[PDB]
PDB file of all heavy atoms in Angstrom:
ATOM      1  N   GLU B  77      41.347 140.473 150.591  1.00  0.00           N
ATOM      2  CA  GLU B  77      40.306 141.473 150.438  1.00  0.00           C
ATOM      3  C   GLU B  77      40.511 142.617 151.424  1.00  0.00           C
ATOM      4  O   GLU B  77      41.137 142.468 152.475  1.00  0.00           O
ATOM      5  CB  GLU B  77      38.926 140.854 150.646  1.00  0.00           C
ATOM      6  CG  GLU B  77      38.395 140.134 149.430  1.00  0.00           C
ATOM      7  CD  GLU B  77      38.315 141.034 148.219  1.00  0.00           C
ATOM      8  OE1 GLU B  77      37.764 142.148 148.340  1.00  0.00           O
ATOM      9  OE2 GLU B  77      38.809 140.630 147.147  1.00  0.00           O
ATOM     10  N   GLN B  78      39.973 143.777 151.065  1.00  0.00           N
ATOM     11  CA  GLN B  78      40.070 144.975 151.892  1.00  0.00           C
ATOM     12  C   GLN B  78      38.681 145.582 152.010  1.00  0.00           C
ATOM     13  O   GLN B  78      38.143 146.109 151.031  1.00  0.00           O
ATOM     14  CB  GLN B  78      41.063 145.972 151.300  1.00  0.00           C
ATOM     15  CG  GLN B  78      42.511 145.562 151.479  1.00  0.00           C
ATOM     16  CD  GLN B  78      43.470 146.472 150.744  1.00  0.00           C
ATOM     17  OE1 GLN B  78      43.065 147.260 149.893  1.00  0.00           O
ATOM     18  NE2 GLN B  78      44.752 146.367 151.071  1.00  0.00           N
ATOM     19  N   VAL B  79      38.099 145.500 153.207  1.00  0.00           N
ATOM     20  CA  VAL B  79      36.775 146.063 153.426  1.00  0.00           C
ATOM     21  C   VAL B  79      36.811 147.581 153.528  1.00  0.00           C
ATOM     22  O   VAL B  79      35.786 148.233 153.302  1.00  0.00           O
ATOM     23  CB  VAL B  79      36.142 145.447 154.683  1.00  0.00           C
ATOM     24  CG1 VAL B  79      35.793 143.995 154.427  1.00  0.00           C
ATOM     25  CG2 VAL B  79      37.093 145.553 155.853  1.00  0.00           C
ATOM     26  N   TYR B  80      37.959 148.160 153.855  1.00  0.00           N
ATOM     27  CA  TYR B  80      38.127 149.601 153.877  1.00  0.00           C
ATOM     28  C   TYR B  80      38.583 150.078 152.499  1.00  0.00           C
ATOM     29  O   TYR B  80      38.847 149.283 151.596  1.00  0.00           O
ATOM     30  CB  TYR B  80      39.118 150.005 154.970  1.00  0.00           C
ATOM     31  CG  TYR B  80      40.508 149.417 154.814  1.00  0.00           C
ATOM     32  CD1 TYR B  80      41.506 150.110 154.137  1.00  0.00           C
ATOM     33  CD2 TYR B  80      40.827 148.182 155.362  1.00  0.00           C
ATOM     34  CE1 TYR B  80      42.769 149.581 153.992  1.00  0.00           C
ATOM     35  CE2 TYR B  80      42.092 147.645 155.222  1.00  0.00           C
ATOM     36  CZ  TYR B  80      43.056 148.350 154.538  1.00  0.00           C
ATOM     37  OH  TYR B  80      44.316 147.821 154.395  1.00  0.00           O
ATOM     38  N   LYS B  81      38.692 151.394 152.336  1.00  0.00           N
ATOM     39  CA  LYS B  81      39.242 151.953 151.111  1.00  0.00           C
ATOM     40  C   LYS B  81      39.905 153.287 151.422  1.00  0.00           C
ATOM     41  O   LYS B  81      39.580 153.953 152.407  1.00  0.00           O
ATOM     42  CB  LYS B  81      38.171 152.111 150.024  1.00  0.00           C
ATOM     43  CG  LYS B  81      37.132 153.177 150.294  1.00  0.00           C
ATOM     44  CD  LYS B  81      36.273 153.406 149.058  1.00  0.00           C
ATOM     45  CE  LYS B  81      35.230 154.484 149.291  1.00  0.00           C
ATOM     46  NZ  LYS B  81      34.331 154.646 148.118  1.00  0.00           N
ATOM     47  N   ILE B  82      40.851 153.663 150.566  1.00  0.00           N
ATOM     48  CA  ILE B  82      41.654 154.868 150.740  1.00  0.00           C
ATOM     49  C   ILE B  82      41.100 155.935 149.812  1.00  0.00           C
ATOM     50  O   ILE B  82      40.985 155.713 148.600  1.00  0.00           O
ATOM     51  CB  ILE B  82      43.137 154.606 150.447  1.00  0.00           C
ATOM     52  CG1 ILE B  82      43.584 153.272 151.047  1.00  0.00           C
ATOM     53  CG2 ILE B  82      43.986 155.747 150.964  1.00  0.00           C
ATOM     54  CD1 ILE B  82      43.586 153.242 152.552  1.00  0.00           C
ATOM     55  N   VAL B  83      40.762 157.096 150.373  1.00  0.00           N
ATOM     56  CA  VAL B  83      40.134 158.169 149.615  1.00  0.00           C
ATOM     57  C   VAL B  83      40.732 159.489 150.094  1.00  0.00           C
ATOM     58  O   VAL B  83      41.246 159.596 151.208  1.00  0.00           O
ATOM     59  CB  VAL B  83      38.589 158.126 149.778  1.00  0.00           C
ATOM     60  CG1 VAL B  83      38.166 158.458 151.206  1.00  0.00           C
ATOM     61  CG2 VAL B  83      37.850 158.955 148.718  1.00  0.00           C
ATOM     62  N   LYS B  84      40.708 160.492 149.215  1.00  0.00           N
ATOM     63  CA  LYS B  84      41.261 161.801 149.541  1.00  0.00           C
ATOM     64  C   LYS B  84      40.220 162.756 150.112  1.00  0.00           C
ATOM     65  O   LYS B  84      40.524 163.519 151.035  1.00  0.00           O
ATOM     66  CB  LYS B  84      41.903 162.419 148.299  1.00  0.00           C
ATOM     67  CG  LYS B  84      43.211 161.768 147.893  1.00  0.00           C
ATOM     68  CD  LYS B  84      43.849 162.509 146.734  1.00  0.00           C
ATOM     69  CE  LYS B  84      45.311 162.137 146.576  1.00  0.00           C
ATOM     70  NZ  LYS B  84      46.095 162.473 147.796  1.00  0.00           N
ATOM     71  N   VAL B  85      39.001 162.739 149.584  1.00  0.00           N
ATOM     72  CA  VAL B  85      37.950 163.649 150.031  1.00  0.00           C
ATOM     73  C   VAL B  85      36.735 162.832 150.455  1.00  0.00           C
ATOM     74  O   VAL B  85      36.506 161.743 149.913  1.00  0.00           O
ATOM     75  CB  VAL B  85      37.586 164.654 148.929  1.00  0.00           C
ATOM     76  CG1 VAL B  85      38.665 165.712 148.808  1.00  0.00           C
ATOM     77  CG2 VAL B  85      37.397 163.940 147.603  1.00  0.00           C
ATOM     78  N   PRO B  86      35.931 163.303 151.408  1.00  0.00           N
ATOM     79  CA  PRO B  86      34.717 162.561 151.769  1.00  0.00           C
ATOM     80  C   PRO B  86      33.592 162.768 150.770  1.00  0.00           C
ATOM     81  O   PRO B  86      33.782 163.385 149.718  1.00  0.00           O
ATOM     82  CB  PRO B  86      34.360 163.129 153.144  1.00  0.00           C
ATOM     83  CG  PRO B  86      34.873 164.504 153.098  1.00  0.00           C
ATOM     84  CD  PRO B  86      36.156 164.439 152.318  1.00  0.00           C
ATOM     85  N   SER B  87      32.409 162.256 151.096  1.00  0.00           N
ATOM     86  CA  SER B  87      31.260 162.362 150.212  1.00  0.00           C
ATOM     87  C   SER B  87      30.719 163.792 150.197  1.00  0.00           C
ATOM     88  O   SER B  87      31.177 164.673 150.930  1.00  0.00           O
ATOM     89  CB  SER B  87      30.174 161.383 150.642  1.00  0.00           C
ATOM     90  OG  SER B  87      29.665 161.730 151.918  1.00  0.00           O
ATOM     91  N   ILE B  88      29.719 164.017 149.346  1.00  0.00           N
ATOM     92  CA  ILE B  88      29.121 165.343 149.224  1.00  0.00           C
ATOM     93  C   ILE B  88      28.280 165.661 150.455  1.00  0.00           C
ATOM     94  O   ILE B  88      28.417 166.731 151.057  1.00  0.00           O
ATOM     95  CB  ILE B  88      28.291 165.440 147.931  1.00  0.00           C
ATOM     96  CG1 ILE B  88      29.198 165.273 146.710  1.00  0.00           C
ATOM     97  CG2 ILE B  88      27.528 166.755 147.875  1.00  0.00           C
ATOM     98  CD1 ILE B  88      30.081 166.471 146.424  1.00  0.00           C
ATOM     99  N   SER B  89      27.347 164.763 150.794  1.00  0.00           N
ATOM    100  CA  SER B  89      26.630 164.686 152.071  1.00  0.00           C
ATOM    101  C   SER B  89      25.665 165.837 152.362  1.00  0.00           C
ATOM    102  O   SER B  89      24.927 165.767 153.349  1.00  0.00           O
ATOM    103  CB  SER B  89      27.613 164.552 153.238  1.00  0.00           C
ATOM    104  OG  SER B  89      26.937 164.650 154.478  1.00  0.00           O
ATOM    105  N   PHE B  90      25.626 166.866 151.513  1.00  0.00           N
ATOM    106  CA  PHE B  90      24.749 168.016 151.703  1.00  0.00           C
ATOM    107  C   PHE B  90      24.645 168.773 150.388  1.00  0.00           C
ATOM    108  O   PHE B  90      25.630 168.887 149.657  1.00  0.00           O
ATOM    109  CB  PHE B  90      25.264 168.963 152.795  1.00  0.00           C
ATOM    110  CG  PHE B  90      24.663 168.718 154.147  1.00  0.00           C
ATOM    111  CD1 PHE B  90      25.465 168.374 155.223  1.00  0.00           C
ATOM    112  CD2 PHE B  90      23.299 168.832 154.344  1.00  0.00           C
ATOM    113  CE1 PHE B  90      24.917 168.145 156.471  1.00  0.00           C
ATOM    114  CE2 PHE B  90      22.744 168.604 155.589  1.00  0.00           C
ATOM    115  CZ  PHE B  90      23.555 168.260 156.653  1.00  0.00           C
ATOM    116  N   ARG B  91      23.456 169.294 150.100  1.00  0.00           N
ATOM    117  CA  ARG B  91      23.253 170.128 148.926  1.00  0.00           C
ATOM    118  C   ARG B  91      22.182 171.163 149.229  1.00  0.00           C
ATOM    119  O   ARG B  91      21.390 171.011 150.161  1.00  0.00           O
ATOM    120  CB  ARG B  91      22.858 169.303 147.698  1.00  0.00           C
ATOM    121  CG  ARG B  91      21.689 168.371 147.935  1.00  0.00           C
ATOM    122  CD  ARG B  91      21.486 167.435 146.759  1.00  0.00           C
ATOM    123  NE  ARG B  91      20.887 168.112 145.614  1.00  0.00           N
ATOM    124  CZ  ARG B  91      19.578 168.224 145.418  1.00  0.00           C
ATOM    125  NH1 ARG B  91      18.728 167.705 146.291  1.00  0.00           N
ATOM    126  NH2 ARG B  91      19.118 168.855 144.348  1.00  0.00           N
ATOM    127  N   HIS B  92      22.164 172.221 148.423  1.00  0.00           N
ATOM    128  CA  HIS B  92      21.233 173.325 148.600  1.00  0.00           C
ATOM    129  C   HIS B  92      20.480 173.581 147.306  1.00  0.00           C
ATOM    130  O   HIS B  92      21.051 173.492 146.216  1.00  0.00           O
ATOM    131  CB  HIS B  92      21.959 174.601 149.034  1.00  0.00           C
ATOM    132  CG  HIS B  92      22.683 174.473 150.336  1.00  0.00           C
ATOM    133  ND1 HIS B  92      22.031 174.434 151.548  1.00  0.00           N
ATOM    134  CD2 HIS B  92      24.003 174.382 150.617  1.00  0.00           C
ATOM    135  CE1 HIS B  92      22.918 174.317 152.520  1.00  0.00           C
ATOM    136  NE2 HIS B  92      24.123 174.285 151.981  1.00  0.00           N
ATOM    137  N   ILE B  93      19.198 173.905 147.436  1.00  0.00           N
ATOM    138  CA  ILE B  93      18.340 174.243 146.308  1.00  0.00           C
ATOM    139  C   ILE B  93      18.013 175.728 146.401  1.00  0.00           C
ATOM    140  O   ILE B  93      17.561 176.205 147.448  1.00  0.00           O
ATOM    141  CB  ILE B  93      17.062 173.381 146.297  1.00  0.00           C
ATOM    142  CG1 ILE B  93      17.363 171.993 145.731  1.00  0.00           C
ATOM    143  CG2 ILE B  93      15.950 174.034 145.484  1.00  0.00           C
ATOM    144  CD1 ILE B  93      17.702 171.995 144.252  1.00  0.00           C
ATOM    145  N   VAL B  94      18.267 176.459 145.322  1.00  0.00           N
ATOM    146  CA  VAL B  94      17.959 177.879 145.282  1.00  0.00           C
ATOM    147  C   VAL B  94      16.509 178.065 144.855  1.00  0.00           C
ATOM    148  O   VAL B  94      15.873 177.170 144.294  1.00  0.00           O
ATOM    149  CB  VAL B  94      18.915 178.650 144.350  1.00  0.00           C
ATOM    150  CG1 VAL B  94      20.357 178.370 144.730  1.00  0.00           C
ATOM    151  CG2 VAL B  94      18.657 178.286 142.897  1.00  0.00           C
ATOM    152  N   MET B  95      15.979 179.248 145.138  1.00  0.00           N
ATOM    153  CA  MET B  95      14.604 179.589 144.812  1.00  0.00           C
ATOM    154  C   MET B  95      14.564 181.062 144.423  1.00  0.00           C
ATOM    155  O   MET B  95      15.596 181.678 144.141  1.00  0.00           O
ATOM    156  CB  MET B  95      13.675 179.277 145.991  1.00  0.00           C
ATOM    157  CG  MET B  95      14.070 179.980 147.274  1.00  0.00           C
ATOM    158  SD  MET B  95      12.839 179.815 148.575  1.00  0.00           S
ATOM    159  CE  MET B  95      13.077 178.125 149.091  1.00  0.00           C
ATOM    160  N   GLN B  96      13.354 181.627 144.399  1.00  0.00           N
ATOM    161  CA  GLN B  96      13.197 183.055 144.150  1.00  0.00           C
ATOM    162  C   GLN B  96      13.741 183.905 145.289  1.00  0.00           C
ATOM    163  O   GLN B  96      14.070 185.074 145.069  1.00  0.00           O
ATOM    164  CB  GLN B  96      11.724 183.392 143.922  1.00  0.00           C
ATOM    165  CG  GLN B  96      11.129 182.786 142.666  1.00  0.00           C
ATOM    166  CD  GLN B  96      11.588 183.488 141.407  1.00  0.00           C
ATOM    167  OE1 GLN B  96      11.979 184.654 141.440  1.00  0.00           O
ATOM    168  NE2 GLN B  96      11.542 182.780 140.286  1.00  0.00           N
ATOM    169  N   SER B  97      13.840 183.348 146.492  1.00  0.00           N
ATOM    170  CA  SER B  97      14.301 184.115 147.639  1.00  0.00           C
ATOM    171  C   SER B  97      15.810 184.298 147.613  1.00  0.00           C
ATOM    172  O   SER B  97      16.557 183.403 147.208  1.00  0.00           O
ATOM    173  CB  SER B  97      13.893 183.423 148.938  1.00  0.00           C
ATOM    174  OG  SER B  97      12.504 183.565 149.171  1.00  0.00           O
TER     175      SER B  97
END
Side-chain angles (χ1 to χ4, degrees):
Chain B
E77 279 303 311
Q78 286 173 346
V79 290
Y80 60 92
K81 69 170 181 184
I82 318 293
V83 67
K84 287 185 164 300
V85 285
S87 65
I88 297 287
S89 172
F90 265 119
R91 52 189 285 271
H92 299 286
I93 281 292
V94 307
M95 57 171 75
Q96 294 286 336
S97 287

